[PDB]
Enzyme design. Structure first.
Site, PDB file in Angstrom:
ATOM      1  N   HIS A   1      20.568 -52.494  11.605  1.00 48.73           N
ATOM      2  CA  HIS A   1      21.549 -51.633  12.252  1.00 48.73           C
ATOM      3  C   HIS A   1      22.553 -51.080  11.264  1.00 48.73           C
ATOM      4  O   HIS A   1      22.833 -49.876  11.253  1.00 48.73           O
ATOM      5  CB  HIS A   1      22.328 -52.408  13.307  1.00 48.73           C
ATOM      6  CG  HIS A   1      21.531 -52.758  14.517  1.00 48.73           C
ATOM      7  ND1 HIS A   1      21.742 -52.158  15.742  1.00 48.73           N
ATOM      8  CD2 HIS A   1      20.527 -53.646  14.694  1.00 48.73           C
ATOM      9  CE1 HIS A   1      20.901 -52.670  16.621  1.00 48.73           C
ATOM     10  NE2 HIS A   1      20.149 -53.568  16.011  1.00 48.73           N
TER      11      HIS A   1
ATOM     12  N   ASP B   1      38.878 -38.679  17.513  1.00 44.37           N
ATOM     13  CA  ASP B   1      38.223 -37.732  18.398  1.00 44.37           C
ATOM     14  C   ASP B   1      37.038 -38.379  19.096  1.00 44.37           C
ATOM     15  O   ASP B   1      36.671 -37.974  20.204  1.00 44.37           O
ATOM     16  CB  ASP B   1      37.814 -36.505  17.598  1.00 44.37           C
ATOM     17  CG  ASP B   1      39.013 -35.715  17.113  1.00 44.37           C
ATOM     18  OD1 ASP B   1      39.701 -35.104  17.959  1.00 44.37           O
ATOM     19  OD2 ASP B   1      39.308 -35.743  15.895  1.00 44.37           O
TER      20      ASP B   1
ATOM     21  N   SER C   1      13.311 -60.578   7.796  1.00 40.56           N
ATOM     22  CA  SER C   1      13.815 -61.633   8.679  1.00 40.56           C
ATOM     23  C   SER C   1      13.646 -61.302  10.165  1.00 40.56           C
ATOM     24  O   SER C   1      13.389 -60.140  10.507  1.00 40.56           O
ATOM     25  CB  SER C   1      15.304 -61.887   8.344  1.00 40.56           C
ATOM     26  OG  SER C   1      15.553 -61.900   6.938  1.00 40.56           O
TER      27      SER C   1
ATOM     28  N   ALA D   1      14.998 -57.794  -3.136  1.00 41.23           N
ATOM     29  CA  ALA D   1      13.944 -56.969  -3.672  1.00 41.23           C
ATOM     30  C   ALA D   1      14.335 -55.502  -3.605  1.00 41.23           C
ATOM     31  O   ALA D   1      14.841 -55.040  -2.573  1.00 41.23           O
ATOM     32  CB  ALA D   1      12.641 -57.176  -2.893  1.00 41.23           C
TER      33      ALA D   1
ATOM     34  N   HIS E   1       5.722 -56.144   8.837  1.00 41.37           N
ATOM     35  CA  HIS E   1       5.715 -56.438  10.265  1.00 41.37           C
ATOM     36  C   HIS E   1       5.862 -55.185  11.110  1.00 41.37           C
ATOM     37  O   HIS E   1       5.639 -55.236  12.329  1.00 41.37           O
ATOM     38  CB  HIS E   1       6.837 -57.401  10.642  1.00 41.37           C
ATOM     39  CG  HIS E   1       6.682 -58.766  10.058  1.00 41.37           C
ATOM     40  ND1 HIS E   1       5.476 -59.430  10.026  1.00 41.37           N
ATOM     41  CD2 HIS E   1       7.582 -59.598   9.484  1.00 41.37           C
ATOM     42  CE1 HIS E   1       5.635 -60.606   9.442  1.00 41.37           C
ATOM     43  NE2 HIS E   1       6.905 -60.737   9.115  1.00 41.37           N
TER      44      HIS E   1
ATOM     45  N   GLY F   1      12.783 -49.572  10.302  1.00 39.07           N
ATOM     46  CA  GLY F   1      13.150 -49.262   8.928  1.00 39.07           C
ATOM     47  C   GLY F   1      11.993 -49.369   7.949  1.00 39.07           C
ATOM     48  O   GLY F   1      11.885 -48.569   7.015  1.00 39.07           O
ATOM     49  N   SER F   2      11.111 -50.358   8.143  1.00 39.32           N
ATOM     50  CA  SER F   2       9.914 -50.444   7.308  1.00 39.32           C
ATOM     51  C   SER F   2       9.015 -49.231   7.499  1.00 39.32           C
ATOM     52  O   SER F   2       8.430 -48.721   6.535  1.00 39.32           O
ATOM     53  CB  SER F   2       9.124 -51.716   7.619  1.00 39.32           C
ATOM     54  OG  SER F   2       9.836 -52.863   7.241  1.00 39.32           O
TER      55      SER F   2
ATOM     56  N   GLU G   1      10.655 -46.158   5.690  1.00 37.57           N
ATOM     57  CA  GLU G   1      10.528 -46.337   4.249  1.00 37.57           C
ATOM     58  C   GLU G   1       9.097 -46.036   3.803  1.00 37.57           C
ATOM     59  O   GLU G   1       8.873 -45.293   2.838  1.00 37.57           O
ATOM     60  CB  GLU G   1      10.939 -47.764   3.830  1.00 37.57           C
ATOM     61  CG  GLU G   1      12.446 -48.125   3.910  1.00 37.57           C
ATOM     62  CD  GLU G   1      12.832 -49.457   3.178  1.00 37.57           C
ATOM     63  OE1 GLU G   1      13.067 -49.449   1.933  1.00 37.57           O
ATOM     64  OE2 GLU G   1      12.883 -50.523   3.844  1.00 37.57           O
TER      65      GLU G   1
END
Length: 402
Positions: A15, A113, A236, A282, A299, A303-304, A307
């Site tokens: 996040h 705002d 994780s 890493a 997994h 985000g993986s 990327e």
């Protein structure tokens, strides 16, 4: 006229990092933001602080409220099990009173705002926003397909409040791009937002250990072949069993590809000078962007996916937590842009029906790779000028001025 925006991110890195990438995006478009964080998370804001002055960028550090089910000095989800997410919801809901007291002191001119806080914290953030009659825009690092499947569950468990609160917010920003899942953006916009404001803004990109980052790249440049090294990097919480770790280790050895395994192992660290095992942090984004890296065993957290997409690699999917399965459904089953190598959290792969898979995975011919590359080209168009994510960044910024 440019808006001042209170940013309230959720303290887990899936996040936090895109939420801060989006704050950088906002600041480039002329906004001024203040970021509310808990103390052990102030370091996260160091990159932002180096890039914009205190004039435009401000920190608001509040003490982390206590809770007997969280051990002390733990203020982020990297450090505790997947169940305790409900405890972190309870703790951070008690920033409600400190936050109202802070805003009630400001000159009414200085008040924001808009609030751009995590969808996960929306049950109390929306109450704060209403109290001051401020725009409450939620944020999610997951994609519209995932939001679709989750919001539709008849039992949303303890996500019921934040999902409901997210449906009640002024609008929702997500880390995806329209052309990837347009059916699913439109279901969310029509079916799960009471007003109907969804901004796809992704892929949000960075604005940038046991072995240092400068030395891994020397090993990568040692690789003669482009598109020839497979990066195995699991995120994780879930760690692998001694049996699963031993299965994959035999796969990497028997496969005899060059690999980088980011983490029991055994005998095998010194056995194969085709593989490099790194313990701890890493340089992931750096690895997947190297021409020598052609596949990524993951997994399939979101985000993986982005990327690997933006880096142009074969995604070998081994899902284990709910988001991973939604994404497998999307990226493998529906889009045929990745290959499934694992079933679930208890699977044990066979050493060379996986080593076969690995040693043929970086190859550019296979249809999943060619589909993934066409998606990568779509993703580039979305963030360049003229793309849908870029325009949605412009429109979101003018919108917070309303």
């Amino acid at each position: 006229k440019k808006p001042h925006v209170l940013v309230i991110p959720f303290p887990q890195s899936g996040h936090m990092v895109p939420h801060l990438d989006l704050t950088h995006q906002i600041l480039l478009r002329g906004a001024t933001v203040t970021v509310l964080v808990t103390p052990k998370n102030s370091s996260y804001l160091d990159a932002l602080r180096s890039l914009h002055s205190p004039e435009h960028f401000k920190t608001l550090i509040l003490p982390f409220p206590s809770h007997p089910c969280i051990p002390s000095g733990v203020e982020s989800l990297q450090q505790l099990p997947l169940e305790a997410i409900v405890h972190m919801f309870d703790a951070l809901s008690r920033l409600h009173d400190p936050l109202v007291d802070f805003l009630s002191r400001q000159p009414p001119s200085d008040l924001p705002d808009a609030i751009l806080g995590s969808s996960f914290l929306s049950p109390w953030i929306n109450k704060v926003a209403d109290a001051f009659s401020i725009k409450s825009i939620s944020f999610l690092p997951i994609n519209a397909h995932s939001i679709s499947v989750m919001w539709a569950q008849e039992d949303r468990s303890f996500f019921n409040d934040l999902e409901t609160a997210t449906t009640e917010s002024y609008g929702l920003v997500i880390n995806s791009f329209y052309d990837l899942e347009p059916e699913f953006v439109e279901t969310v916009k029509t079916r799960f937002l009471n007003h109907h404001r969804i901004w796809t803004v992704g892929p949000l990109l960075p604005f940038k250990s046991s072995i240092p980052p400068a030395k891994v790249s020397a090993w990568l440049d040692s690789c003669p072949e482009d598109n020839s090294v497979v990066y195995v990097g699991f995120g994780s919480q879930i760690r692998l069993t001694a049996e699963q770790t031993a299965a994959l280790a035999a796969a990497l050895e028997k496969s005899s590809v060059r690999f980088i395994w980011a983490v029991p192992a055994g005998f095998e660290e010194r056995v194969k000078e085709k593989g490099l095992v790194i313990r701890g942090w890493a340089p992931q984004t750096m690895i997947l962007e190297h021409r020598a890296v052609g596949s990524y065993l993951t997994h399939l957290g979101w985000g993986s996916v982005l990327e690997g997409m933006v880096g142009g690699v074969m995604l070998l999917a081994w899902p284990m937590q709910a988001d991973h399965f939604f994404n497998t459904t999307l990226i493998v089953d529906k889009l045929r842009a990745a290959v499934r190598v694992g079933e679930n959290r208890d699977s044990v792969p066979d050493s060379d029906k996986l080593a076969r898979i690995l040693a043929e995975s970086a190859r550019e011919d296979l249809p999943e790779r060619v589909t993934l590359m066409k998606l990568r080209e779509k993703a580039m168009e979305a963030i360049k000028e003229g793309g849908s994510s870029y325009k949605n960044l412009d429109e979101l910024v003018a919108e917070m001025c309303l």
